[PDB]
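pls ignore typos typing on phone
MOI + seq
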Amino acid sequence: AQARKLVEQLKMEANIDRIKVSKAAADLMAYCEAHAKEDPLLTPVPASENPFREK
Amino acid sequence: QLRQEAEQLKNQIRDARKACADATLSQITNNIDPVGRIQMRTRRTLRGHLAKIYAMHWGTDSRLLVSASQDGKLIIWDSYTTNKVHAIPLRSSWVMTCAYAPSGNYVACGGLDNICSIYNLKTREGNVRVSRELAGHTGYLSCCRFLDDNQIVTSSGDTTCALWDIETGQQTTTFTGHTGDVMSLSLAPDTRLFVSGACDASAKLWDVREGMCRQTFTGHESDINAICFFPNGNAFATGSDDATCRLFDLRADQELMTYSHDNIICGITSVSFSKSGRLLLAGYDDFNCNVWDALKADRAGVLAGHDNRVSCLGVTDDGMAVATGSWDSFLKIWN
Amino acid sequence: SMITAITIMALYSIVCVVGLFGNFLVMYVIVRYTKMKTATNIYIFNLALADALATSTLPFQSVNYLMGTWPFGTILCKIVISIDYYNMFTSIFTLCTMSVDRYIAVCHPVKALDFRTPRNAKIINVCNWILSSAIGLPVMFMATTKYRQGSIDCTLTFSHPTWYWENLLKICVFIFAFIMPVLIITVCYGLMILRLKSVRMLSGSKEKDRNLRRITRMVLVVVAVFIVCWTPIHIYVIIKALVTIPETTFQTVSWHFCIALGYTNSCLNPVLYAFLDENFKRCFREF
Amino acid sequence: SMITAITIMALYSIVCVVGLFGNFLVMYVIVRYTKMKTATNIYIFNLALADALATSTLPFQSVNYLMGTWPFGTILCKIVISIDYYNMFTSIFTLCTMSVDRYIAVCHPVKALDFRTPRNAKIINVCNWILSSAIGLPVMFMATTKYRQGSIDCTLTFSHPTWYWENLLKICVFIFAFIMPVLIITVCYGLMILRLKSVRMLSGSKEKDRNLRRITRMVLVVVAVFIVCWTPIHIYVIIKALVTIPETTFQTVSWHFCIALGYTNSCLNPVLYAFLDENFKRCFREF
Amino acid sequence: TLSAEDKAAVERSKMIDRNLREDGEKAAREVKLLLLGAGESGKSTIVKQMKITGIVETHFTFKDLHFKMFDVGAQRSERKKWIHCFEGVTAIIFCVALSDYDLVLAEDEEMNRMHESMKLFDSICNNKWFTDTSIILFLNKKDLFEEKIKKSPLTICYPEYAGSNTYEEAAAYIQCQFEDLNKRKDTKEIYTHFTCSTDTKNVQFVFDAVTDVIIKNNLKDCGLF
Amino acid sequence: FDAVTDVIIKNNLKDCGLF
Amino acid sequence: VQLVESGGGLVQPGGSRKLSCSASGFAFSSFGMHWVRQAPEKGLEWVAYISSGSGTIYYADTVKGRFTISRDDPKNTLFLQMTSLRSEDTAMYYCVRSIYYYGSSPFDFWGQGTTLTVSADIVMTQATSSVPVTPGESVSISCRSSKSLLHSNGNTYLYWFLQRPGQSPQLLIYRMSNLASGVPDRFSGSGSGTAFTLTISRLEAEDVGVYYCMQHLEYPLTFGAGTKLEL
Ligand SMILES: CC(C)CCC[C@@H](C)[C@H]1CC[C@H]2[C@@H]3CC=C4C[C@@H](O)CC[C@]4(C)[C@H]3CC[C@]12C
Ligand SMILES: CC(C)CCC[C@@H](C)[C@H]1CC[C@H]2[C@@H]3CC=C4C[C@@H](O)CC[C@]4(C)[C@H]3CC[C@]12C
Ligand SMILES: CC(C)CCC[C@@H](C)[C@H]1CC[C@H]2[C@@H]3CC=C4C[C@@H](O)CC[C@]4(C)[C@H]3CC[C@]12C
Ligand SMILES: CC(C)CCC[C@@H](C)[C@H]1CC[C@H]2[C@@H]3CC=C4C[C@@H](O)CC[C@]4(C)[C@H]3CC[C@]12C
Ligand SMILES: CC(C)CCC[C@@H](C)[C@H]1CC[C@H]2[C@@H]3CC=C4C[C@@H](O)CC[C@]4(C)[C@H]3CC[C@]12C
Ligand SMILES: CC(C)CCC[C@@H](C)[C@H]1CC[C@H]2[C@@H]3CC=C4C[C@@H](O)CC[C@]4(C)[C@H]3CC[C@]12C
Ligand SMILES: CC(C)CCC[C@@H](C)[C@H]1CC[C@H]2[C@@H]3CC=C4C[C@@H](O)CC[C@]4(C)[C@H]3CC[C@]12C
Ligand SMILES: CC(C)CCC[C@@H](C)[C@H]1CC[C@H]2[C@@H]3CC=C4C[C@@H](O)CC[C@]4(C)[C@H]3CC[C@]12C
Ligand SMILES: CC(C)CCC[C@@H](C)[C@H]1CC[C@H]2[C@@H]3CC=C4C[C@@H](O)CC[C@]4(C)[C@H]3CC[C@]12C
Ligand SMILES: CC(C)CCC[C@@H](C)[C@H]1CC[C@H]2[C@@H]3CC=C4C[C@@H](O)CC[C@]4(C)[C@H]3CC[C@]12C
Ligand SMILES: CN1CC[C@]23c4c5ccc(O)c4O[C@H]2[C@@H](O)C=C[C@H]3[C@H]1C5
Ligand SMILES: CN1CC[C@]23c4c5ccc(O)c4O[C@H]2[C@@H](O)C=C[C@H]3[C@H]1C5
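k done
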């Protein structure tokens, strides 16, 4: 009975729409490139704009 | 016949995964230039913990942060000024997780006592008291995250992940199907779905509304200690005990990239992402945090200065700072 | 119960009255007749003053025992405990100084010409009171009043850890007020007796031998009274600290009896030192 | 004549160089690596500082012997004599405090939980330096420079009578720096060894018995080095005071050799306490 | 420089620092003990004797020494993942019953309880997180063991034991078997005590073992050991 | 000298009052 | 949460009087305590402050020395000691609880006020004194300062209070960016350094009262004159 429930969930998992990996990779790269300027970690912020400063 | 049918269906899913994949991600990411050396210097050194720190959760305002220790204290801090905003005494010392609400009103904690305690911060009395105690877990709570001020998703050691109505005090949706305790969980930005990794080397995508298992990934050798979503909500890097970090795509339904290095054999405790998502920051057992790149798959920086093992790591909401959690009872903020 | 309390209060009353009468009588004879023109009379006057100030705190302990609580206040509790600790060391150091004075007077006469001057006796006595201030001031700072079982208690409170500083106080008071003074007094008087036996003047005839025997008897009485009086209270404090003993009526009587012997030495110091002094005895016989 | 002076100067130079190298090396390892987060490392750091400050005055005595006169001036003469007397008592009191620390750590573990804290170690160490100020300040006041045979002499001058205060200083320094520390160290370590033998963990197997024998050997080496180093200089000072001895080349060599042994203990304190410490030994093996 | 609210917030942080240092000084003196064993070993009995879901915490004070006992028997989850939390513990109290050898395990009845307790002790003793932590071993139900060993021999469960049927010999042999399971005998003591109906002796034995552990810790702190 | 020393001892003992 | 004052009545000049305020329903030891006085026909005025744990104590320059402030945490009572009272001290004294951390709302709860009648520096400027308004229209209230309240951390320390006639005053807007807990969205604060503006959309009869602007940049705290509205 437990094995039947496992097979039922496995059948549910199998029938899923899968897109091409290259298109998703292009989406991931475009998202990373677009928001790079906003990210403080990638490009160092000036000290005056920086909330954390030496005391 | 059904037992053999399960193996045949798994073989069919494997064949479909192989059929979908055509190009390796490392070949496609060759075009983008490497980020280069990334040097982060400690800005603040935070004290007041006399016991082993296990977890920290960032506030939405990027200034407030909570910390969980074995002295029986949840201490809410001010990152900019190094002040202690609140100090919450705990009934049970053994605590393994702590969450901060998106509105900032509530703070959760949980551990070996099988109880999730919700702490109100905007009370008129002025002392942080217990609002609601969640019970009914047969296993140790390992992670908890606020979907809303009234809803919270917790992971437990009884192989059951539950959705809790804070006001009602009972569980609405129950999630089952993990062989072995669920070490952690992360919330997507849209908050409609979450993925939780367990100790059967699997990470299963879950749907809060439907309540059933959407996807399952089995790319890990041993077990999953940590799991964090990407900012778009379609990918999630995973941390494991086999000294590897793996990236899984929800739409592609397969493993994108694998992060590993020969000399590092220690397990990964925690992973996180920057604002853009380009930098993958992880926590290791070798006392040194390593920064990785989402596309280039190299080491962008090394964080050192933690005397004892790194329990947790979290990157703030706007991405201005990174505070690392270690077992030496010091939280250090890296900009 | 009633008989024990009456006996203890009567013992303290007799000790206090005899001590105050002897000390103030010696100070009255010194001030009105001798006028402190000699070094030995300065030492005897400082001994009488230290014994009078030590005996003055005794009715406060009598009231403390009879009532069971301290109603005198925190400030007077500090003053009484500080004066008690201060004048115990002051009286014992005065006894040691007089023993060293008689040792230098007999064994080193040429050096005694330099030593036995009124100015040097005033300097050494002021140094004795200053050295006693080292135990006087911190005991004054530490003494407070704490409520125990609804009754105020006048005692000493120590900073954490309590056990370490309490043992450090008890051991330092024991060594500095018992071990070193008994050794100094015993060795100095014993060598003094040996030198007096060596003296050709003291020997030779029956009358001179009688005078030598009287001097040796006086010295032995001084040493015996000092040891017999101060030995039980110090040993009892050490035993009480080391081994917890159940409270008994006999235990309470032994505690207040050892304290009575400790003050009894101060009471008998005028009789031994001033009354038996030949120079004072001539003054009493003249008037 | 020439050979004797060269030998004495070489002995002082070897003692000073080894002592400064050991003391500053231990203070460098403590500051750069340990950072004084534990009570025992605070005691070892104060021991190293006291030994370094005591060894720092040694070339001034070397120049004083070689020249035969003191050209450094009155103020520096006061500073050198005061630092020498101050840091001798400071180093010996630090040794006594570490002996009491290990005694409480073994025999009274529940009380050692209260005693062995960094705060209490800082309080007791500050009390040790304050108690050493009692011998530091008056020696600073008394030290002057007097012209003897056309040569300046850096020494201590006492108020009249000179003999009384000079004996009082010598006897107090002898008792407080030799008699009481040897008794405290010997009794505390002996009872510590008896308690360690009582411990079931240390006995039982050949390897554990070997470790127990190594601990007992370490304790006996510490006690033996302390007694052997400090005993000749104190006994020689007492003999020199009591009995006048004719000046001889051998007498001068014995005087500077006993002073060399006295500083030699301070030189060998880093080797015994810090270098043989397992916690420091792990730090040396890691780097 | 700082405003009035910033100064008052710094003063609030200093008051929180004073409270945290006071609570840390209170917590440092308290001795933490880990309780382990099977469910039917007799954990509740020995806890009630010493006194007179999730984690059960017991507070008792003996000879001015505070004890924390943590009972972890309620949890059903995998022990390997939360065992690293208990690294800084004074001693491990491991309780088993001597009468378990004839009573077969309830789960499938294919393995003797005594050998499951041997594997239970073997996993805890050889754990990488517990290398210098001593184990306080308690052997429970000795009177029932005496009756059971009179009625039934010890040879039937495993033929390796060939000694004569004696209560003292069988008890000492089972004690030796538990002692043999230790693979690092120099840095880890095993304190074995037979439990009984007398309440005082168990608490005394625990105080003696904890006193020896505090002696070991103080000697390591000094550096002699 | 010895007689003078004995006279000084007598004067000292008289000053102390033991004699 | 409740604060009640006792010890009022008539006092002869040159005498002494010791007030006591009892606290109920909150942790008294964690809040700093303010004394605020009010003249009968003038605005409010600050008296003194004691911090939690008695770490720091501040006074106004006009009341320095004569007034002594203390607090007792195990009995939860705030004590004000008054010595050598003068004819200008005929005012009603309020007790105020103020917690201080990032995101806190100090001056949120006000006392009831005890009457005391005796018988013989950043200047906050209210430009207007009284404006007749009708229920429904938007109401504009302006306050000005003598010093720029914009601190370098970004916070502007201006608090807005409303004292309803015959009732205790309540906090409306704290730090000019945040609304107080329990205040509707009808009130809004805007402006910049040295020029502040208060707007009341959808006027109500309960809103009618006296409006105070308070600076909290440095001690002594100086209040506004008080803009009163009417119908
Ligand atoms: C509170 C008191 C007891 C503290 C100690 C006071 C000291 C400073 C007092 C008490 C006894 C006093 C001495 C008593 C007797 C003499 C002899 C006289 O010819 C010169 C003064 C001299 C030498 C006094 C000097 C000052 C003195 C030593
Ligand atoms: C030669 C004789 C006169 C020397 C006598 C020295 C005496 C007076 C000094 C030296 C050491 C001092 C002690 C040092 C430390 C303490 C601990 C403190 O919490 C109480 C005072 C107390 C107990 C001091 C009392 C006075 C003291 C005992
Ligand atoms: C045991 C320690 C702690 C205290 C000892 C104090 C006494 C007993 C010591 C200290 C100074 C010593 C004296 C030093 C010098 C001399 C001169 C000699 O011609 C006779 C013996 C005599 C007088 C010694 C006798 C013993 C003595 C008085
Ligand atoms: C030798 C002479 C002069 C003095 C002897 C002093 C000592 C040895 C004597 C005098 C007082 C005696 C104590 C009197 C009372 C008690 C309480 C009792 O429950 C135990 C014995 C004990 C503690 C005695 C032990 C011995 C004792 C301390
Ligand atoms: C050298 C000076 C500075 C310190 C001397 C420390 C020694 C002598 C002190 C410190 C710790 C003390 C012990 C602390 C606790 C107890 C238990 C009590 O029931 C009997 C006394 C006893 C056993 C004390 C005896 C004296 C003691 C051992
Ligand atoms: C001229 C000098 C030598 C006089 C004595 C100075 C005293 C006051 C100095 C010298 C050594 C110093 C100690 C050295 C080491 C430590 C450990 C550190 O973690 C806290 C401060 C502390 C405890 C210091 C306190 C102050 C101290 C005791
Ligand atoms: C328990 C131990 C630490 C107590 C040590 C007490 C020492 C430090 C104190 C107590 C008695 C003091 C001595 C008392 C009298 C004099 C005479 C003076 O002209 C020089 C200083 C000198 C010699 C003092 C030096 C410091 C001293 C020896
Ligand atoms: C001889 C005088 C001048 C100095 C003596 C100092 C030393 C040797 C004395 C002073 C305090 C004494 C200790 C007092 C208390 C105890 C507790 C007991 O359970 C063991 C012995 C022990 C530890 C004593 C041993 C000897 C001791 C340490
Ligand atoms: C037991 C060992 C470790 C230490 C022995 C120290 C004493 C006993 C030794 C070491 C130095 C020796 C002294 C060396 C020089 C002289 C000068 C000579 O003209 C008389 C003998 C005399 C005074 C010696 C007497 C004995 C002596 C003081
Ligand atoms: C108890 C304290 C305060 C005072 C102790 C005084 C004693 C020990 C002092 C004072 C007088 C001193 C004596 C004075 C003179 C000499 C002659 C000298 O060639 C040998 C030492 C000798 C013999 C001294 C030995 C020590 C001595 C006897
Ligand atoms: C004269 N007088 C002084 C103070 C006190 C005391 C004595 C000896 C050693 C002490 O440690 C000590 O302290 C107290 C007290 O314990 C008991 C008796 C009294 C007595 C003797
Ligand atoms: C370390 N150092 C300190 C000062 C001094 C000295 C010592 C012992 C007893 C003394 O009385 C004494 O005083 C001087 C001097 O006489 C000879 C050696 C030196 C040595 C030891």
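Residues D 84-85, 88, 170, 173, 233-234, 237, 259, 262 surround MOI (ligand 12) (CB under 6 Å). The CA atoms of residues 70 and 79 of chain G lie 5 Å apart. more later
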